From a paper:
The comparison between the cryogenic and non-cryogenic structures was direct because the crystallization conditions for SFX-XFELs and conventional crystallography were identical. By overlapping the cryogenic structure with the non-cryogenic structure, we observed a good agreement with RMSD 0.31 Å, except for helix III and rotamer changes in the protein residues. Even though the unit cell volume of the non-cryogenic structure was greater (by approximately 3.35%) than that of the cryogenic structure due to the cryogenic cooling effect, we directly compared both structures, and found significant structural changes associated with protein functions and characteristics. When the cryogenic and non-cryogenic structures were compared, the orientation of the helix III was found to have shifted toward helix VI by 7.1 degrees. In addition, the number of water molecules in the non-cryogenic structure is lower than the cryogenic structure, from 29 to 12 molecules. However, this phenomenon is thought to be a combination of poor resolution and changes in the dynamics of the water molecules as a result of temperature, since several water molecules that cannot be seen in the cryogenic structure are clearly visible in the non-cryogenic structure. At ambient temperature, the number of water molecules making up the hydrogen bond network was reduced from 3 to 1, and the direction of the sidechains, such as Asp64, Glu92, and Asn120, also changed. At ambient temperatures, the non-cryogenic structure had a relatively wider catalytic cavity volume in the DDE triad compared to the cryogenic structure. The average B-factor of the DDE triad in the non-cryogenic structure (94.5 Å2) was 22.2 Å2 higher than that in the cryogenic structure (72.3 Å2), and the B-factor of the DDE triad was 10.5 Å2 higher than that of the entire structure. The B-factor in the non-cryogenic structure of IN-CCD also shows good agreement for their dynamics properties in solution state analyzed by NMR, which is not seen in the cryogenic structure.
The integration of the viral genome into the host genome during the life cycle of the HIV-1 virus is an essential process of infection. HIV-1 integrase (HIV-1 IN) plays a key role in virus integration without the need for any other co-factors. HIV-1 IN consists of three domains: N-terminus, catalytic core domain, and C-terminus. The HIV-1 IN catalytic core domain (IN-CCD) itself has integration activity and the activity is eliminated when DDE triad (formed by Asp64, Asp116, and Glu152) located on this domain is mutated.
Residue numbers in the entry:
A (entry chain A), B (entry chain A): 56 to 140, 148 to 188, 194 to 209
Write the structure that this text describes.
């Protein structure tokens, strides 16, 4: 519920790798299709994420994905630390896969379908996650 | 000054292409290094952008970059239209190139340097652009 906590995980679909970042307090999602699970891709994603949102701590369900020199250097430079302290994260990753399946025919490539699904998830109201994160961040500014 | 207007342009550095999106009302920036200037890369970028921020209209200094079937299909699906209505956009693209030059040694690859520069630009206060965009968006929600 703290506004700087994000959850990062990878999932697999059609032989490809989808990196999914969830803003825990709001359920707002950022995702990316990457060619392979590598430290360089995780580091680049963290650096991008932290330049766009105030990323204070990152949690993950696979701690070993954060052990590479490259990843630690990105967290070091951006000032990110590892979160050492549930149902939100489960529901967001599972709803994402459902939406991807729904819009899969609308897109030539998986990566396009993934961004359509992120779009749909963040705008769908039940307020939307996208409205909740800006409200959470803007109120925290005060 | 309307909260849904973005400016998109490409610039070149070290033989590579940097796609820069500026939120006009705040000066908040999103950037990406792409391998080549193609409609597919512009479309993918727009789709990503619109899933993260409320993108209503897009302006550009090279109108021909928005003519491809691929790009129009992305704007169609995301509900984006073309803005047909100054000093902000100039200052943001020029300050970005300056910061890249400053942090260039800190990074192995240009794309890393670009994300460091985006990070620095959005956080630098003179409020920051990153604080201004969430304030602008959250107030507009009301
Ligand atoms: C494990 As993944 C790369 O996040
Ligand atoms: C994700 As880090 C290593 O903090
Ligand atoms: C011209 As550019 C691709 O924006
Ligand atoms: C950028 As569109 C074509 O609207």
């Amino acid at each position: 519920c703290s506004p700087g906590i994000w959850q990062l995980d990878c999932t697999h679909l059609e032989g490809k790798v989808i990196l999914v970042a969830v803003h825990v307090a709001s359920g707002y999602i950022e995702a990316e299709v990457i060619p392979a699970e590598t430290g360089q891709e995780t580091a680049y994603f963290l650096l991008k994420l932290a330049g766009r949102w105030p990323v204070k701590t990152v949690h993950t369900d696979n701690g070993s994905n954060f052990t590479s020199t490259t990843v630690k250097a990105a967290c070091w430079w951006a000032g990110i630390k590892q979160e050492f302290g549930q149902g939100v994260i489960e529901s967001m990753n599972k709803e994402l896969k459902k939406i991807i399946g729904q819009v899969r025919d609308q897109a030539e490539h998986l990566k396009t379908a993934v961004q359509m699904a992120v779009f749909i998830h963040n705008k769908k109201r039940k307020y939307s996650a996208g409205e909740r994160i800006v409200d959470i961040i803007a109120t925290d500014i005060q």
